[PDB]
Amino acid sequence: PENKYLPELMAEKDSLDPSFTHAMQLLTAEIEKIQKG
Amino acid sequence: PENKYLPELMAEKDSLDPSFTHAMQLLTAEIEKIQKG
Numbered sequence A, B: 001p002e003n004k005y006l007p008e009l010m011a012e013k014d015s016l017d018p019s020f021t022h023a024m025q026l027l028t029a030e031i032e033k034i035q036k037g
Helices: A002-015 A021-036 B002-015 B021-036
Strands: none
Touching: A002 A021, A002 B021, A021 B002, A021 B021, B002 B021
């Protein structure tokens, strides 16, 4: 569910190491999609 | 570019900590998309 999935993404996102560019990018994008709806 | 982007994904994927379920899932999915074409 998106409502719980969103904070999950932000938590993984903000905890994930920046050395993983694509992993960080994909987390960023998915959050954008939920944020925009 | 997909040709270089794919090994990047696999490297981040296989180096990323499994505690990041969604980060790991999104890396997995993107690889599938390039793999399938």
